[model samples]
Target: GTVNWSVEDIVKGINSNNLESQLQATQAARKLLSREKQPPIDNIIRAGLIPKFVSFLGKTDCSPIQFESAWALTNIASGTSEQTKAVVDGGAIPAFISLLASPHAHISEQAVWALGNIAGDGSAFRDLVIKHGAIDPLLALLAVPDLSTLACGYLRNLTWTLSNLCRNKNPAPPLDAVEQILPTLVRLLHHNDPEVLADSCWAISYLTDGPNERIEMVVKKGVVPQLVKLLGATELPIVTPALRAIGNIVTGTDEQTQKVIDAGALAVFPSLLTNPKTNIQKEATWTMSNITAGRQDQIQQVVNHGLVPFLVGVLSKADFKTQKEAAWAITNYTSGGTVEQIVYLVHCGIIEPLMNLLSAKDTKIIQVILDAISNIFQAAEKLGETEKLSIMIEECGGLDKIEALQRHENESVYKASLNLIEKYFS
Candidate 1:
């Protein structure tokens, strides 16, 4: 790569009336700036050339020139945030989006590549990209007539673009904008390619991340059946996002949670518990936590699935990251499970680990653990076994932990601890 040309000279070359001169300059810039070790991105951006490139991007008749300009823009937009802001600053969004429908897959793929960077930079630009009608043409990439077979790379970039488009919340992409991508997400959910399957699962995770209404939009697409299948993927890339989608779905209403149950997420989960990646293990714990947070029969299905022993073991032995998730799974069961379910947990040896979490640093965890312990005590009282449970708690050093919690800085912990001692330990 010849790295010696001044950016102003490059811009002058591109500013000419001669199309040949324009193409040569942009082609050099795309190559010169495309390198990883040191690209002249700063010089090209500072040379006031992005607007020039964006202007050339929509010159459909000048596509050879258009192609070179887009390649330069994609590499340039790949810079730091301020550098990317320059691409968006030149009003590059509509130009890049307009290229989505181009008959040339390379041009369309370049558009998606640049937009993927733009959408990932921050929420503002992503919304701007979304608000300006990028959705329909983006989806229409699938209909590009064998483009799927001709360019799997196109689907990869397109799928990633859709993920970035569907990503982020706390000022999520406008709901109407999000709805447009669902059918495509569902369509690609079944794709044989891991890249497309992976990104589509992430897109589904983002859409389902909010509330039940958002989950309803995705589940209505009939993608849940596909979700269960991907959960069985041995590949890490596909399985992680697949678990994330399954995890997100279980957080919805009991009816929505039940759909996940009936969809057979439970069968797939225990297998993941022993998965080598703690990331997978953590999400598996998280999904179980959500399912256990549901109703009695559902909790019993988890019981039927033989998940408690694994969950109890995770609570005792896993990292804090996973232990917290495991604690919630066990605690949620305590809060919602039937008396018989509670008895099963007791027999599974839940008390030792349940008491150990009293010292967990999070007040949220502390409060929930305290409440779950109270629920366990109440369950024993109903079984006329409170004193027997008391002896079990004292032996596990739980009574000492409960007495110490009476002065926890959090009000709820103090009261939960105080109530437990007043009624039982007194």
Candidate 2:
């Protein structure tokens, strides 16, 4: 009780799961961030015991202890980039990843959350974090009952991290890495735990973000309707997760996208748009985008639900990506718009933003944008609502410019764009 408390004391508490000790110790460290309260370097360096602390994080007999220790370590590691580098290099990742297969549910859950946050920095850990093989153990843990609930909650965290890591797909992870886990993840869609089911769906959503074969394969196994049913449930916890899962999955497959439509998820999602909870609303909008991604048949469903006014209201202050997604959905859903609705989008100046997105670099956003534009033209033909269709084509450039993208390098974008153009030709 002299000049300062030792880091060794805190590290021992974290390693041993001594909660009171951990908090008191961390409080002292937090105080050090200020000069008057600063602790000695010897105390900070004593945190060198962190690796030993991370080791017990997945011990079967000490699952909660492991979780507690990991949580404290997470607090310690967070925002401190150097600590992150050390923990990962000091071999924290392999241990954390190993916990993906942990026999202890809490330990595995904590491990998944820890691994996601640790790798989330978009640094060197990106490769190991997004590697398809790492996905296998996390999904496998969901099949176990006690763990599935925790599994469900962490799915969003895990996938959101993957989403962050995969921004450009720069170091394209090995294909077999994805192969090892996609099938098992599909089967987990049927899991009894809503949270587990929700997370798995969310993770799958991220994994299939690319237009790779795995996306089609997961769709064929039928992941959408269940998501709709979950979203439609009266329970908020389950419903929100279901909505996110459905939204995430729909982004991957037009087949599944149509299935989301046929299940009436389009009708159920608007309330999610207005949800007071940010996560629910963000995911709700996400699901809505998927509902109409490439299929123009769902517009009637959305309009019948009065989604336009709600969408328009959200647009002014919504985040740019959310606004883009919302706009794209409106454009696609109205592909077969009643004459009046076509006039509405035309009059509202929706065509420019819709057209601008056509040249977007992100594969998913680009698909939605083009899908909406195609519907805009088709609506013109059917409703005799050639109003903005002329301007739309003019701003977008005509068929020649549209046709040029057919030779684009991204296989998925090229194929999807070609299919949309072919739909009009026929």
Candidate 3:
């Protein structure tokens, strides 16, 4: 029978000279901490079990004590940030981090798990992990010789923690350290476990979303082809983060964007646009939008990869958010595309649904749709497709749509419409 004991009884048991008593107390604390409810955790924290658990983490001779103590501390950290703050403020951070290199894998894994929960608490706790020099050791785990074949094991938890650590806003990890981790994160993309791949790809996404120089650093590490290769992953967990990482990478300078496009990301668009998950579709559309922002050949890479039909279809049939992304993608292509690329859009039948989007009164939608339409007309004029495109627009009630925009409350929409009419329909 389980004895109901006071917090004092448990704390005394933890501090007892007898190893059995201490072990049993920590095991009890672990079980108590493992409950699915929160109030017990609150009670445990108030009972002052956190400092005792941390002291056990500092014990050298007792692996069992360290294991249970670290586990108990990890659960405590899984509570509120204040509760996690208790672990950190109790001096568990260094004790916990030191266990990462423990000869015992259980102790090491628990320490990583606890650190992840602490970092997950928010930026302050996360930076505490960083300030304690957590990144170097965490990054070191990925280089372990046998991890590639062991993704579902301890390595998964370790990489998962790396993902959490990188998930900060504004100022991110130190650039030099981030530079060190970039190639490691890139190598982790090849992990067979979808979870590991997801975590690795997520790290890349966060890193690339940083300053332009960091974006260039990630690109230089040769992340492009690997991410493009991950686009073929059947699991959404793997594919989604990979797509996001690629999407962020291509947002760098033209040289960076070109590296990704040159790596065959464009060829994957037609398939990605057909993703069953609308969010994935939105990200795919967003990725191509950035691709379209690149040079003419980069824009043509999208067209040549047969993305036109999907882009047109998304504009016509996908959800409104995806439609906006698709419209923006077309906007970039039309605005920066060569006249031949614009003609290709026309041949793919982009104008009909594009013309249909004019009925959407949302200002941003109207803005992108108008921008795409204006660039289309400009391209048509440059290619002598003006009369032909005009005929197409007139046949599709295009002039009426452009004229309708004159009444739009948005000045950008009104001006874009006015310019399109003055230049072409006039």
Candidate 4:
């Protein structure tokens, strides 16, 4: 206690063949850094001790030494990007990656703990970890029945590390690397643990968060059922990001959308649409729009689920953000659905709400509302029911609302309005 060891004393002790001195010095540095104080980014740097800690990660024979050394680096990297860079620059990444296979769960768990902080810092560090092959051991850990007992901290840390790996993709993750995450991403969804399932939810969103090709890859792994089930999950953390992953999936091709719909996403949507959470409702409606953008069968899939009433409810009464998404779902179907599908919308009381949204302040909403009306009219004209539909619009005072937009502020809204007015009202 009398001897407060400085760097020269600490590193010399760790540097010596005296295992006792090495272990004690490593533990002390680790303990000092682990202090809850604002981690001394500058103090630790001036001490010049980060590389000494990193070097212990390779001491497979002396796990307590390796354990304390990695323990030190874990807290060291947990600091801000400035401090994380110090750990990374000390080449802590490859050392941490190699520790992932350590027979000691404590050491491997700490490896995940440390590397997660590094990867979570920025995309470049994340990709570098992947480039050095971090994924193989991360995924390999999940395959081990012993590690996944869920009683341990390792499984929890592993999934979160995977979550960070799959997210923060401003440039998106490497195509091949994300592709590598699929089987395990889906496999973890089966875990009864909400922590694991919740982490997998974000992983799925980020991985499927890219282009249609990426979404399709996640879809091909048969992730939809588990994803849709999570949509109905009671936990917000799990349900929310599962909604995100499903949202990305429907944004893919028509067949890709059907995979979502066939999973009874429509059945789940009713509850999600009514969710009190604003983001959940908003995203749920946005996903609905993507579904309606597909073929007639897909649009009918929505209608058959009896979602038309729900869409109108959201469009007319939900917050503006939710309303806009609901409007797109309706508008997309107007052009994509067949005559029978269009007629179903008419009987569902979509007209009043549809007419109501025409005066929406946002030009984006107004534009879609105008296009929805035009398509509705075309369907009416095809059914030779134009007179009846026009009478209904006139009753709702939608005619004057539509006619007034003839000189609307937005040029595109004005043009579309004039075309609609000239086509049928004239």
Candidate 5:
């Protein structure tokens, strides 16, 4: 919106080597992210001083200075969408491709981070980064043992960029070279540093699926147990990636699902669900849902870990998504598994609590609970287990007598329950 601010304001501040102004300008740029109604950053990008920052490449004698400029360039490259668009179009991509060749860890890291951020949202940028064999350099960075803890955030983002490239949906411009990269990422999980291990695990979560049999290769590598252990690691900076990896493994074929189970993932999920960390809880609960979905017996192991009471307890305090996932998980668990286990869930008093959830304000939660009730009843009917359910209902003083089990105020929950009851009696 305004030309007076100029690219010189950003560039002069960088080239002048004035630490105070550089830091201040960097902070200003960082602060721009939070302004609700600020001016667009594209004006700065189009002004064309971006290439001056590229000249720092090959200045091996200027170690710290080169590092600073590279850092600024990386953040700038990763900053506003317009800045990224400008750099990629302004030929910074080639300069950046050249920069990764530098030996300085900081310079190389900034380059990797910049390319990763660019690739994250820009399909063309992602394709270019991959086509340029950027994956090889990125793989090398991922391997530097002590480096992950130093640039955990960058690594995490890089990993995320890689994962997106591998997605079966909206396939990016064909890298077809995933074969060369996947092994390095898998090897990264074995590193001793928890942060690197975690980010590596996080970044590769998407590769768990692809037509090229990459997913099978990961499974064959026996990543499941280390992944499960990583999930249980109490001190890791981020746990979602590890949880994500396990979920991805289990969600694939029956063999991978069994691999996840054998890895002891089912046992770890309960604690994650009950753990205080909200992100961990959300991911862990979702992982449990995937494990149980359409594969009932897998949950029996989770159930064997005494997951029911904790899950029912989590339900009592859960937000909308948590409750919905818990209900869906319960539904999956009961849909086709052993009748005694489903009865065990009921006998643990999960039935009445589930019926009470029908009153939740969130329709999805209500719908899930209703569906679980219906599915549980349907399965019970086939197994003649409703006789036992009825006995439990009788002990709970029958469905009609329990005020909580009474019809939900919402029509959808009410109708779903009616359908199940009608199916049962008629």
Candidate 6:
């Protein structure tokens, strides 16, 4: 348990010309750092353990030493960003990148884990890792199969590192680089490991969460069908990210959104609505929000799939966050939907829930509910059904709720309420 001497000896022996001593010292440091509990990183850093482990990363002949050194540094990288900087500034990144190609899968795997932690730290360090050529080797790992149990483990870590590299948003990775690896990431959606599948979907979510070009690339890569398939995954971790990725993709062009719909996402969606995890339910609801933002036929497809009753039920009964997502989706439908679609929604029993949402405290919710009411009112008038909609609002207490909102503190709510009242009630 007395690792003070071992840490000191390792720091001193790291510079030794004797390879055996270097190996022994790395192993000792690994032993000290590899404990199940949090290792004393301050003590290790004080003993000058960082640069020594970094040095062992450069040795070509001994993988055991490389693995130990990488193992120690990996644990260190798990510390605070300042602590991780010790490894980064000590010039360990190049070695970590190089270790990805090491004949020793263990070394490569540990290096990937270390880099994932480092990249996941924040934007600057992630940029540093990418700048030093981490992307190519990381992408290369995706093509490498899970030849053995150990190899599969490495692939998960590799995918995780890849996921973190894609997770940044302030300035995302280069478009060309993401385009290059897009197919490889899509292929991993079918990986047997749920963690790999989750991270792979997570990466796709980030890549498509931005510019239209990236979303187009994901759609062009024909990943929508693959993403839809993943919705059936039983694991919440797998399904949540898959739903997130699909949710983001539908935010793209109409053709891209239809790609997911045509792939039977609606058919798969009803089950996800009842998923025990509220996050999954929220994402599924958000996906529908975007789905309804599409063409008339697309909105009809959702109504025909029997989600309107489900969504109306959620709006009336689900928690506030879920209600917000449900209402937002309904707002999108009402905003863009056809007369038939709007009529179908009211017939699905939305008036009661829409009236219920008028009492929600969130400004955003109140705003969306008002928008849906206005749109539905307009749709009915256009369809020569204004008298029917007015009657329905009266029966459901919608008039009184709109009346109360006239005195609302938020301008948007007050204005929307007045517009509705002037058009229908007054």
Each prediction's Cα RMSD?
A: 2.2, 10.2, 2.6, 3.4, 5.9, 2.5
* lDDT order of candidates, top first: 1, 4, 6, 3, 5, 2
Show how many residue pairs clash in every candidate, following the order shown: 0, 3, 0, 0, 1, 0
Q: TM-score of each candidate?
A: 0.93, 0.53, 0.90, 0.87, 0.76, 0.91
Candidate 5 per-residue lDDT over residues 95-183, each given as its tens digit: 67676778776677667766777776566667777777777766666666564364656665556555545543456346355667667
TM-score of decoy 2:
0.53
Candidate with the larger lDDT of 4 and 6 = 4
Report how far off residue 323 is in candidate 6 (Å): 0.7
Clashing pairs in 6: none
Candidate models: Cα lDDT each: 0.86, 0.59, 0.82, 0.85, 0.64, 0.83
- Indicate the worst ten consecutive residues by lDDT in candidate 6: 142-151
Q: Give the lowest summed-lDDT range of ten residues in model 5.
A: 26-35
TM-score of 4: 0.87
Report the error of model 6 at residue 53, Å: 1.5
Model 4 misses residue 293 by how many Å?
0.8
Model 6: per-residue lDDT, tens digit, 1-426?
Answer: 325345567677766888887777777777777777767777888877788788779889777888888998998898898889988988888989998988887888898999999998887888888889988888777665552344667768877888888878778777766776676787677678888888999988888888777788778888888888888888888888789888888888898888898898898887888777888888888888888888989888888898887888778877678889999999999999888888888888988888988887778889998889889988888878888788888888888888999997998998888888888875
Question: Which scores better on TM-score, 1 or 6?
Answer: 1
lDDT of 5 at 413: 59
| Per-residue lDDT of candidate 3, residues 145-167 (tens digit) | 76665536687898888877877
Candidate 4, residue 167: the lDDT equals 83
How does model 4 fare in lDDT? 0.85
Show where candidate 1 strays beyond 4 Å: 1-4, 15-17, 144-148
lDDT of 4 by residue, 1-426 (tens): 413556566667777888878899888777677667564556767777888788778888899999988888888788888888999999898999999999888888999988899998889999999998899988888876644565445677888998888887777888888778777777778887898899989889888877788888788888898898888899999998999999998888888888988898889888889899999999999999998899987887788788988987888798888988988988899989999999999888888887887777788889888888888988988879887888899899898888888867898888988887777776
Give me the candidate number with maximum lDDT: 1
Per-residue CA lDDT of model 1 for 313-338, tens digit only, reads 88888778888898888888999988
Clash pairs, model 2 backbone: 152-195, 152-196, 299-333
Winner of 5 and 6 under TM-score: 6
